[PDB]
Design a protein around this ligand. Sequence first.
Ligand code: CLA
Ligand code: CLA
Ligand code: CLA
Ligand code: CLA
Ligand code: CLA
Ligand SMILES: CC1=C(/C=C/C(C)=C/C=C/C(C)=C/C=C/C=C(C)/C=C/C=C(C)/C=C/C2=C(C)CCCC2(C)C)C(C)(C)CCC1
Ligand SMILES: CC1=C(/C=C/C(C)=C/C=C/C(C)=C/C=C/C=C(C)/C=C/C=C(C)/C=C/C2=C(C)CCCC2(C)C)C(C)(C)CCC1
Ligand SMILES: CC1=C(/C=C/C(C)=C/C=C/C(C)=C/C=C/C=C(C)/C=C/C=C(C)/C=C/C2=C(C)CCCC2(C)C)C(C)(C)CCC1
Lengths: 30, 49, 140, 161, 108, 31, 31, 49
Amino acid sequence: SISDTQVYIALVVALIPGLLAWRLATELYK
Amino acid sequence: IPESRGQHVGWDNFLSTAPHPAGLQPFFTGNWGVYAQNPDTAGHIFSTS
Amino acid sequence: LETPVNASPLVKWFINNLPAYRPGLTPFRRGLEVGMAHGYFLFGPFAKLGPLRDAANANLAGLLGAIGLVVLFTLALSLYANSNPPTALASVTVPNPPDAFQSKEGWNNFASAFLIGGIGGAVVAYFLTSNLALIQGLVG
Amino acid sequence: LPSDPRNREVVFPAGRDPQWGNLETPVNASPLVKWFINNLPAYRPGLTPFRRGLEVGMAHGYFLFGPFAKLGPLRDAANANLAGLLGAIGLVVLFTLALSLYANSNPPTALASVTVPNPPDAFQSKEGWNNFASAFLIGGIGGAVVAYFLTSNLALIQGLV
Amino acid sequence: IRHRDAIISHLNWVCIFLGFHSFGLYIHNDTMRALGRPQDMFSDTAIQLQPVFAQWVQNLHTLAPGGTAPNALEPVSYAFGGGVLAVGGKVAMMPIALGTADFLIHHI
Amino acid sequence: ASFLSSIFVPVIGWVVPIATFSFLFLYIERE
Amino acid sequence: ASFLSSIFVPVIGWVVPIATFSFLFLYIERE
Amino acid sequence: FGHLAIIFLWASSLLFHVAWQGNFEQWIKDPLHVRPIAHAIWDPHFGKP
Ligand code: CLA
Ligand code: CLA
Ligand code: CLA
Ligand code: CLA
Ligand code: CLA
Ligand SMILES: CC1=C(/C=C/C(C)=C/C=C/C(C)=C/C=C/C=C(C)/C=C/C=C(C)/C=C/C2=C(C)CCCC2(C)C)C(C)(C)CCC1
Ligand SMILES: CC1=C(/C=C/C(C)=C/C=C/C(C)=C/C=C/C=C(C)/C=C/C=C(C)/C=C/C2=C(C)CCCC2(C)C)C(C)(C)CCC1
Ligand SMILES: CC1=C(/C=C/C(C)=C/C=C/C(C)=C/C=C/C=C(C)/C=C/C=C(C)/C=C/C2=C(C)CCCC2(C)C)C(C)(C)CCC1
């Protein structure tokens, strides 16, 4: 499989849409 | 009566041990003569088996 | 209407002496006896009916389960507290509410003492069921 | 990443009075941060002053089991976790003094920042700070026992989960 | 008709109480066998639910000849006790033994 | 790194609905 | 009787300054 | 744009759960008998059989 290191890169990169999804879903109103 | 037969029954083991090997099944079925089976004989040395 | 179940004086005397309704108690004191009571028996169905009930850690399976569900109730008390709760009812067996169950501040005091008592009630049930032969040597 | 979008700003001043010494920044008034700080148990609406110090004591008494038990002098012995329990309980008591010492000195009134628009009204009286101090000792000792109970058998909870 | 709210809502509770504690013991046993946990089931082997109050009444109606009705010879039927009465090869009636599966389906 | 299943699945099983439902219940019941 | 070091040194190390400083802080801040 | 970005986040978990938990490189060697793998089970409620 993939290495143990590469899983943590995928988790940190996944915070970038996780932050932007929180910005879009709150710009669309409450 | 179990202490009379050399058989210790205290607060620790009275919920585990039964006074009769029949054990309350002849009570509700009406076969109460099981409770009057083989008594302590005429050679019963007290507090022994 | 009015029956010998909702209004017999044996039952009126009982329900007016539960810690939810006993007069003259701080809401910390009310949640303290309610917590210790409900933390005591809820050790029961986790320890002797749980998934690891035959193992050597059977009573510890019941301790972490019962503590871990008092924490779930304590959230639900604080969820009911923080929701601006409506004022409590007054039945035919209890003519008045205990006056600490209408403010948000009073349910928060009730919520914490449930957690303090509910954990302690589960630990003492873990202490008494793991030390059965201790007690029956202190008795016989 | 244009915000409103080529325009406008965020450092509008505090309460629209620029002559006050404070500003509204994305660390001051971003509504996830303002919602967080207003709902810590020091600041949450609807709490007894005994109720406020009860959560604050359970939180601060919890992690202070940590650095004593894993960095203290007895950290290789059989009493490695009991040395962290007596150090954590022994230092909540040093904080229970400092709360009672602060409370009895006729303490000043609490501030009102920009992320928290009011002090929680229980922090202006000597009797108010004393209930916060009595709760902190109860919750601080209890919060260190439950840290002692979990870490002393880490193999057991992981097997029981 | 005065207390018809007390009749229905106390009957509404029992229908709900019997729904979980009788049918949910099948859903419990569906899941424990599917999860490969046969020792956690409500069966004759793992967790007994023996019908004590109907295993007792069969033992009274088995022992009624000679006892509480001395004039009979065999019981009122062989469904309670007695023996196996074969007619040719096929069984006419055999003693019906109640167990854990018979506890669940009588409470369904 | 298969131990991340032990820390993401209980959070999504337990912590995610508890944090969501306790937010939504206090949001729908908000004057 | 060398065990008196175990009971005088922690009192003078811990208890004596805690009792002194908590008296003096409440005395200098006293209207 | 919100429903469109669910689709790419969905299709990325198909790639990641196969690269990390599936047997794609073992499936290249013989696709006619090697049986593919979607993801892995972490279920605490499982019994040992
Ligand atoms: C002159 C007075 C004095 C005395 C008697 C001590 C005594 C001690 N220090 Mg020390 N220390 C002192 C001054 C003093 N210190 C000063 C001035 C400093 C600042 C430079 C330090 C900084 C220091 C550090 C950084 C550390 C010590 C540690 C220790 C302990 C080493 C033995 C051991 O393994 O702990 C075994 C015993 C325990 C782990 C716990 C014992 C129980 C505690 C002390 C109190 C329990 C509750 C108490 C009864 C009530 C509340 C406390 C009370 C004072 C209000 C020992 C208790 C070590 C230690 O363990 O600290 C906790 C440590 O890490 N000291
Ligand atoms: C998808 C999320 C999820 C996860 C990760 C689990 C995980 C588990 N379930 Mg489960 N369950 C779930 C969903 C989930 N469940 C759902 C949706 C249902 C409803 C159908 C159930 C119904 C269910 C039952 C009926 C039972 C379990 C049980 C178990 C445990 C089996 C392992 C064992 O032997 O326990 C060993 C571990 C313990 C006995 C105690 C562990 C410590 C507990 C979990 C918490 C301790 C305190 C905690 C840290 C703080 C408070 C709790 C917090 C959530 C607020 C395991 C922890 C069994 C069990 O033991 O439950 C307690 C059990 O009897 N589950
Ligand atoms: C399979 C289909 C089905 C099911 C499940 C039900 C269920 C129910 N009907 Mg019903 N009904 C049905 C078909 C069904 N009906 C049909 C086809 C008709 C048309 C004529 C009716 C007409 C009808 C009427 C007219 C009445 C009912 C009533 C009832 C209730 C009886 C109480 C009870 O047993 O609840 C207990 C629940 C169960 C037995 C379901 C099993 C649930 C398990 C045990 C627990 C759930 C698992 C888990 C914990 C879930 C959480 C997971 C988590 C992740 C969310 C219950 C809600 C009566 C009622 O409400 O009064 C009591 C009533 O008056 N129904
Ligand atoms: C929507 C897409 C999606 C779905 C359904 C799943 C499904 C699953 N993942 Mg996975 N995953 C995905 C994308 C997805 N993955 C991506 C992109 C990554 C890289 C960051 C991962 C990284 C990952 C790890 C590291 C692990 C899982 C695990 C799991 C399993 C348990 C659930 C869990 O703990 O989630 C874990 C969730 C995350 C780590 C973060 C979620 C990331 C996506 C992008 C969020 C999507 C949110 C969604 C769009 C919101 C809409 C909700 C909808 C109801 C409207 C399950 C098979 C666990 C497993 O295999 O257990 C055996 C496990 O350990 N996933
Ligand atoms: C000022 C004089 C003085 C000084 C500096 C010391 C110094 C010391 N003594 Mg000692 N001692 C003295 C006089 C003095 N002694 C006298 C007169 C007695 C007889 C009562 C003792 C009996 C004594 C015992 C029994 C022990 C010590 C111990 C110690 C050591 C640790 C400190 C301690 O616990 O104090 C202990 C202090 C007392 C028991 C009482 C103090 C008595 C004097 C008269 C008080 C002086 C106060 C001073 C004048 C106030 C001014 C303060 C200044 C800053 C302005 C240290 C070497 C301990 C030791 O050796 O540990 C290894 C120990 O066990 N001492
Ligand atoms: C720091 C660090 C770390 C950590 C991190 C983490 C742990 C992460 C996680 C991750 C995660 C946790 C992620 C998340 C994500 C999320 C997402 C990505 C989301 C998405 C969503 C969406 C898409 C949305 C949508 C929507 C909208 C838009 C609207 C409304 C509706 C809805 C909601 C549906 C590690 C360890 C690695 C390493 C070291 C460093
Ligand atoms: C029989 C009967 C009845 C009754 C029932 C019930 C009601 C029961 C219950 C019971 C129970 C349910 C009990 C409980 C108890 C409890 C207890 C006994 C506990 C104890 C505890 C403790 C002691 C704790 C402590 C602590 C704390 C609090 C905290 C800290 C820690 C500690 C641990 C120290 C009735 C009347 C209805 C009817 C008739 C019959
Ligand atoms: C913001 C944030 C953060 C931070 C956070 C933290 C880190 C926290 C901490 C945490 C902690 C700090 C925790 C705590 C908790 C607590 C607890 C868990 C407690 C418990 C307690 C108890 C359970 C006790 C009880 C008791 C009492 C009270 C009395 C009597 C006795 C007893 C024992 C019963 C992070 C970084 C993530 C990132 C970003 C965001």
